[model samples]
Target: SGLVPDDEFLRGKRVLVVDDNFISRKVATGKLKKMGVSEVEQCDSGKEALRLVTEGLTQREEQGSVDKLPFDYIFMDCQMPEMDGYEATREIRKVEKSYGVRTPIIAVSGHDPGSEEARETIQAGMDAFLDKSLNQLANVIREIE
Candidate 1:
């Protein structure tokens, strides 16, 4: 409902945004930047997201500290081309579960929260859902943080 110049909790955290579209990625980047998140990583595909997640979890395990990982949360776009968000999310879970660490993965979509797509996102193992709004984004961040 309002624009937040910065978020105290978010400002100190690093987050990843995985969306196949340029516009949405930019929008997310702007949103994250506005919140003053310390770091923002952007990827256009699910495979890339998996790679990042794998690498992060591996480092976290090797170092034996959650701080070794960069991303505290992931905003996963649901409709990627080859490896859609659902499949990508499942793969992430497999990799992270192996390392015994998990990062909150939020579903990003334009569909209504009550729609089948929303249900699919949650069922796919996402921790939260956002309907492409700053308020929704903020709420999810609060809920997950």
Candidate 2:
């Protein structure tokens, strides 16, 4: 299949993109939207990302439905001013375990993917790593789905 999924591929999908850089966030947001992901959400800090994840899970629980989570995947920036992506992923994993929910998280970083950082990212609870430049963002999202 092509890198771009069907228009409906992202229709029911909810995604969170977390990055401290304004341009990075905008790029991700634009690409996802252009690819037909209408539910893409963005946040500037890992702390804020954690809050959103926790609150989303809570709301899902209160609604008492077996429906998919408020978020399906997270594009997480590894380095940020507040609570790095590693820490945020850890927190999200903890909450997911408690609620028996699973959300795919992909670490986004400028770090060399062949370096130890990639391994650390997986250990920190991310499913995979992506260059923060987002050159392969669409392919990564397609693969994940």
Candidate 3:
């Protein structure tokens, strides 16, 4: 009904937006901001997103503190030039499994949700599937929270 719904849940929620397309990434980031998320970071490539999540989780461990990881969730575009979201998500899953850490990653793609795309996304360890329209982000975030 409004630009942002249930804003309280988003407070202090750090998020990452990973998309090769500049406009998509920007729009997602802006929407997250307007939704009142505490922090949002962007990565243009799956490889970079994987690196950042890995590093952030490792740092949190090394510090031996209970502070939150750098980002709470990731919005990942399924198609990219090099690594692609599936590969990156798998890699992230492997690292998290090794470290006993889990972070929710939502797969965002233009593919039809009823197709094999969603099945593949779930198999890759992403927490959820989102259409590229990004229209239901508020409700999705609420559900995730």
Candidate 4:
């Protein structure tokens, strides 16, 4: 089948954008907001990202509208070649194991699809590799949404 993404791809969802660059982070946040995402959290620091991951892990669906929700998805900048070299995403994967809940992580990079490097990302426990500059966000969302 072809890879045209549906309209509800990002609606009403809360996600994290992990990037060290301010401009890129703002760009991502803007795109997500324009795409209909309800909430977007940003973090340039690895330690900050980890704290958010561990704290918001899978809500118990609390009563009285008090909910502590985990991120539905995470966009991690992997400009670096090796996935293992990044501490946050892999560490989040490890944290997920402890919570017994999985959060989908997308490696946002300049790398195109059909990348062998991306395979390394998945085995590192991320869900998909997205080439942001290549306009692959929609397709990647379909894969993990």
Candidate 5:
């Protein structure tokens, strides 16, 4: 069989999925798991996610994984309460400055893809944005790489 094996390699990657909508979170998390990711933490809002990343989790994802894994990646929703994805990304940057850590913050939203709101998110510090459809996961993965 002369075939390149796309083995389940995202096993150890830690991704933070943030969204105000439970359904969206569930769908995204399910897709991530299907992609061979073993560790995924879900957050209802960006503010909740911010606290964990900023302070650093004292415990592992469930109990015993890696003691703690800083969110290597983030999937954020733009219009979350208290703080939007953009604001959250900026806060994470501030935390990174204080703690010296780098985390990829990716914006995910259902809004019209080509609007000022979208541009503002990028300006606010999002590394990239994914539409609600999330059909462009491959491009997003490549962008991060």
Candidate 6:
């Protein structure tokens, strides 16, 4: 089998997809599901993602345990209308620490091919960076593991 199995490799894993463009979200979510992830939650804008994560964390705290549906990964668009990926990731870290939750976030951006900026995305607190045009989905996913 491939390092990532055809089925159940991502079973029970939840992914949060943040993209301002509705079409982009659908495309990304579809691709992730095809890879065997059980759940792909969608959010528009970085701010919205922060809120959702915060709420999930809150529910988890209230329930006295991490949310069973906690996201294993986050696919964050670099640019958004409300907040950019950098700010969103910072906010996510803030909430995660405050709520005692942990999730790997991957920065996804459209950029010049073969540029170092893709690597810098990881410096921006992303577990990995993915360039959209190259469809580096599998690479980013691998880093999270």
Among all windows of ten consecutive residues in candidate 3, which has the lowest summed lDDT? Answer: 1-10
Give the top-scoring candidate (TM-score): 3
- List lDDT for all candidates, in order: 0.78, 0.80, 0.81, 0.69, 0.72, 0.73
- Model 1, 27-87: lDDT tens digits are 9988898888889999999999999988877777778874855588888887889998888
Task: Show the colliding residue pairs in model 6.
Answer: none
Those runs of model 5 whose alpha carbons end farther than 4 Å from true positions after fitting are 1-9, 57-69, 113-115
| Cα TM-score per model | 0.85, 0.86, 0.88, 0.75, 0.80, 0.81
- Candidate 1 segments exceeding 4 Å error: 1-9, 65-68, 113-119
Give residue 123's error in model 5 in angstroms.
Answer: 2.7
lDDT by residue (20-78, candidate 5, tens digit) is 99998999888888777868889987689889886564344335445344776788888
**Cα deviation of 138 in candidate 6 (Å)?**
2.3
Estimate the lDDT of model 2: 0.80
lDDT of 4 by residue, 66-120 (tens): 4334778888776533323246777887877755567777777665546565555
Q: Which residue pairs show backbone clashes in model 4?
A: none
Backbone collision count in every prediction?
Answer: 0, 0, 0, 0, 0, 0
How well does candidate 5 match the true structure, expressed as C-alpha RMSD? 6.8
- For model 2, how does the per-residue alpha-carbon lDDT over 47-129 read when each residue is reduced to its tens digit? 99999999988888898867637788899898998699988998889888878877888888786655566566767778777
Please list the Cα RMSD from the true structure of every candidate, rounded to 1 decimal place: 4.4, 3.9, 4.3, 4.6, 6.8, 4.6
Model 1 CA lDDT for position 20: 97
Ranking by TM-score: 3, 2, 1, 6, 5, 4
Compared with the true structure, model 5 gives a TM-score of 0.80
Q: Looking at candidate 2, what is the lDDT of residue 87?
A: 89
What global local distance difference test value does model 1 have?
A: 0.78
